[PDB]
Amino acid sequence: NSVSVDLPGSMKVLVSKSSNADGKYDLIATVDALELSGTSDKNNGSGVLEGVKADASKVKLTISDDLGQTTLEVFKSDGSTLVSKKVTSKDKVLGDVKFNEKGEVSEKIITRADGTRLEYTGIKSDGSGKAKEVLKGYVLEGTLTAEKTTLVVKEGTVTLSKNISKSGAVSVELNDTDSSAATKKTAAWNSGTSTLTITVNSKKTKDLVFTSSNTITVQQYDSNGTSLEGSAVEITKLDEIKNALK
């Protein structure tokens, strides 16, 4: 009769064992308390399903085999003004979009495959908003623009900026308003090694690595800056990042 198929999210779609006379498969999905039904040309679980909420909100679930992506849309009663959109991509990144009363984006949470998050709130029509990154053990705060996300960590005269481009590319820069040549920090960034090298007084002092694990490590140079010493230490607290900027 029917066969069940597991879906990204905690969702399941029951699909017809065989296609009807028009070549199509019947799809039934239960998503939380919602019952959704639809059709598809394939037997694997891809397709589009629709349902209605108790309060007349319209719901649409789209499963795209070509991208392995599942999109759950909740609309107002018109079926067009968006209330919420949840997208799980095939690499298990989650996007959780909230809309204002005119159906425009106002918030988005991106959850990475490891569970760290980018939280965008107060999003405006120009693509600007407040940004926050939720890492393991600490949170980075900053701003969103249509050009980039900028998370900032300040320590005295030093500002560390972690930038995430619209395409997702990371860069880091260090700005120090200290004007004494003996103490002012400057820094150079390498995207390929994901490393910020901090210099003071023409001597390297430490490398900050921004790991593909979404962690930060710090490794000291010797006091003459001629060599890295010891081994890199993974940051676990915001206090430790600020300490690195003293």
DSSP string, 11-47: -EEEEESS--TTS-EEEEEEETTEEEEEEES-SSS-E
**Number of separate domains in the chain:** 2
Verify that 111 and 94 share a domain, yes or no: no
User: β-pairing, 94-99 with 82-88?
Assistant: antiparallel
The single residue listed with the structure tokens 């997208």 is 87
Name residues whose C-beta falls within 8 Å of residue 144's C-beta, 6 or more positions apart in sequence: 120, 123, 127, 128, 129, 130, 131, 150
Say if residues 93 and 111 touch (Cβ distance below 8 Å).
yes
* CATH code (residue 67): 2.40.128.160
Which of 71, 100, 129 corresponds to the end of one domain? Answer: 100
Where does residue 102 rank: exposed (0-12), middle (13-18), buried (19+ CB within 10 A)? Answer: exposed
The 8-class DSSP code of residue 104 comes to -
Based on C-alpha coordinates, what's the Rg of the chain? 24
Method for structure elucidation: X-ray
Provide the total of helices (H) and of strands (E) in the chain, helices listed first. 1, 21
Verify that 112 and 225 share a domain, yes or no: yes
Which of 85, 100, 115 corresponds to the end of one domain? Answer: 100
Verify that 112 and 26 share a domain, yes or no: no
Verify that 112 and 86 share a domain, yes or no: no
Full residue range of the structural domain in which residue 70 is found? 1-100
Verify that 116 and 164 share a domain, yes or no: yes
